[PDB]
Each structure stands twice: as structure tokens, then as C-alpha cells.
Design an enzyme around this catalytic site. Structure first.
Site, mmCIF file in Angstrom:
data_model
loop_
_atom_site.group_PDB
_atom_site.id
_atom_site.type_symbol
_atom_site.label_atom_id
_atom_site.label_comp_id
_atom_site.label_asym_id
_atom_site.label_seq_id
_atom_site.Cartn_x
_atom_site.Cartn_y
_atom_site.Cartn_z
ATOM 1 N N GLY A 45 36.637 11.981 -0.502
ATOM 2 C CA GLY A 45 37.721 12.361 0.410
ATOM 3 C C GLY A 45 38.924 12.992 -0.296
ATOM 4 O O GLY A 45 39.088 12.872 -1.514
ATOM 5 N N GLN A 50 47.917 14.915 -0.978
ATOM 6 C CA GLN A 50 47.542 14.767 -2.386
ATOM 7 C C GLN A 50 47.592 16.058 -3.240
ATOM 8 O O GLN A 50 47.660 15.953 -4.453
ATOM 9 C CB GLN A 50 46.131 14.185 -2.484
ATOM 10 C CG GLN A 50 46.022 12.713 -2.096
ATOM 11 C CD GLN A 50 44.615 12.210 -2.281
ATOM 12 O OE1 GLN A 50 43.733 12.472 -1.445
ATOM 13 N NE2 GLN A 50 44.384 11.501 -3.383
ATOM 14 N N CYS A 90 40.846 6.172 -6.014
ATOM 15 C CA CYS A 90 41.762 7.188 -5.504
ATOM 16 C C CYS A 90 41.984 8.246 -6.551
ATOM 17 O O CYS A 90 42.276 7.942 -7.726
ATOM 18 C CB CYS A 90 43.114 6.624 -5.066
ATOM 19 S SG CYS A 90 43.931 7.850 -4.096
ATOM 20 N N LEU A 91 41.855 9.505 -6.123
ATOM 21 C CA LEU A 91 42.021 10.640 -7.022
ATOM 22 C C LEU A 91 43.486 10.710 -7.552
ATOM 23 O O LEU A 91 43.727 11.217 -8.657
ATOM 24 C CB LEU A 91 41.546 11.961 -6.343
ATOM 25 C CG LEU A 91 40.085 12.033 -5.805
ATOM 26 C CD1 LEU A 91 39.703 13.420 -5.273
ATOM 27 C CD2 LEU A 91 39.050 11.589 -6.839
ATOM 28 N N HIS A 132 41.333 5.350 4.482
ATOM 29 C CA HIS A 132 41.974 5.659 3.176
ATOM 30 C C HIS A 132 42.777 6.948 3.244
ATOM 31 O O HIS A 132 43.965 6.993 2.874
ATOM 32 C CB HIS A 132 40.870 5.759 2.103
ATOM 33 C CG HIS A 132 41.379 5.953 0.693
ATOM 34 N ND1 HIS A 132 41.384 4.952 -0.235
ATOM 35 C CD2 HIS A 132 41.891 7.091 0.053
ATOM 36 C CE1 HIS A 132 41.846 5.432 -1.399
ATOM 37 N NE2 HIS A 132 42.186 6.735 -1.222
ATOM 38 N N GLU A 133 42.117 8.005 3.730
ATOM 39 C CA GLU A 133 42.678 9.353 3.774
ATOM 40 C C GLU A 133 43.762 9.519 4.845
ATOM 41 O O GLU A 133 44.714 10.270 4.635
ATOM 42 C CB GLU A 133 41.561 10.427 3.941
ATOM 43 C CG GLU A 133 40.503 10.479 2.828
ATOM 44 C CD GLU A 133 41.086 10.747 1.437
ATOM 45 O OE1 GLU A 133 42.133 11.424 1.352
ATOM 46 O OE2 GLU A 133 40.513 10.284 0.417
ATOM 47 N N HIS A 136 47.051 8.338 3.386
ATOM 48 C CA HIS A 136 47.723 9.426 2.627
ATOM 49 C C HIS A 136 48.660 10.278 3.451
ATOM 50 O O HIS A 136 49.747 10.617 2.985
ATOM 51 C CB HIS A 136 46.715 10.390 1.982
ATOM 52 C CG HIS A 136 46.076 9.873 0.727
ATOM 53 N ND1 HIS A 136 46.788 9.550 -0.370
ATOM 54 C CD2 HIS A 136 44.740 9.665 0.408
ATOM 55 C CE1 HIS A 136 45.952 9.131 -1.328
ATOM 56 N NE2 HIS A 136 44.695 9.214 -0.852
#
Ligand SMILES: [Cl-]
Ligand SMILES: [Co+2]
EC number: 3.5.1.88
Length: 162
Positions: A45, A50, A90-91, A132-133, A136
Site C-alpha cells: 500500500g 507519504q 510502513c514505508l 493502515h492507508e 495516513h
């Protein structure tokens, strides 16, 4: 292009994304670049927040074959149920994992890459990744559900990866 993915403790990761105005060629360009960025970084994702684009756009792919592109523009949670959790990554928080509470199933509404409205019922990993996304896009990270000490240790670990 492959875009620049921000890491903590960068304050831009805390901005609330604004709703997408018009789904035009320029928004489709962001979608396509986000996928290229997501795949390049080995992700399932990526939220537009981000890569420092503060509109409500998410790209997901949880498939084994990596050929199942889900696009969520201006997503809206319609219902959720159950509870679950896995050790999430997480990126924007590189190399750090931690179990976080999540709903087991979600139902959402969104616009696709053409601007068409659709509905989606998700469970398992996909439900967790959608949650999760969407976090963000309101400036929320998975570490935010851990203790303040754990949040300070995660920061100093990632932040000593120069
Ligand atoms: Cl995730
Ligand atoms: Co993330």
C-alpha cells in the site's frame, strides 16, 4: 516516475489530505507514479500523504502475483466489524514492525482511477491494509497505537539508519 517517500519524524506525514477535486489526467498521473513507487519499495500500500501529495488518494496491491491494482480516491468507511491484528510495517517507518488493533472486516465507498464510484467489502490482510492507508490520509501512523516509550524507540532506531 518513482517518487520520494517521506519518513518519520517529518511533519508533512501529519497533514490531513484534502478531498480530490476532479479525477482528471493529472490525478491519474499521481496514481500511476504511486504504484511505481509502491512496487519499487516492496509495498502492499501507499497513501498520497507519504509522497508529499496531500489529496485523498491511495494505491494498494496485496496479491501474490502483484497484478491486482486497487485505487481508492476519496474513500469513505461505511461499516466495520470484528477485531484483529498482525505485526504491521510502513514505508515511512523503515525496518520497524508492531502488532496494532484493527477491525477484521470493513466496507468502503471510493472513486476508481476513471472517477467511477464503487463499493468494496474487505477482510483479512486487505481490510488491515485499507485501514493502515486511510490512517495516513488523516495524518496517522501505526506507531501511534503503541506506548509513548515504544514510539520514541521506533523513532531513534529508524532515525539512526543514515
Ligand atoms: Cl499494512
Ligand atoms: Co504505512
Amino acid at each position: 516516475s518513482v517518487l520520494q517517500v517521506l519518513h518519520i519524524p517529518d511533519e508533512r506525514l501529519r497533514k490531513v489530505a484534502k478531498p480530490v477535486e476532479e479525477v482528471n489526467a493529472e490525478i491519474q498521473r499521481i496514481v500511476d507514479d504511486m504504484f511505481e513507487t509502491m512496487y519499487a519499495e516492496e509495498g502492499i500500500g501507499l497513501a498520497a500523504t507519504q509522497v508529499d501529495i496531500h489529496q485523498r488518494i491511495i494505491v494498494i496491491d496485496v496479491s501474490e502475483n502483484r497484478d491486482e491494482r486497487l485505487v481508492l480516491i476519496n474513500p469513505e468507511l461505511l461499516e466495520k466489524s470484528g477485531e484483529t491484528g498482525i505485526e504491521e510495517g510502513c514505508l515511512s517507518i523503515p525496518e520497524q514492525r508492531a502488532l496494532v488493533p484493527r477491525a477484521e472486516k470493513v466496507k468502503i465507498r471510493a472513486l476508481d482511477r476513471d472517477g467511477k464510484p464503487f463499493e468494496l467489502e474487505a477482510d483479512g490482510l486487505l481490510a488491515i491494509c485499507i485501514q493502515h492507508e486511510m490512517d495516513h490520509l488523516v495524518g496517522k501512523l501505526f506507531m501511534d497505537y503503541l506506548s509513548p516509550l515504544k514510539q520514541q524507540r521506533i523513532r531513534q532506531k529508524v532515525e539512526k539508519l543514515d
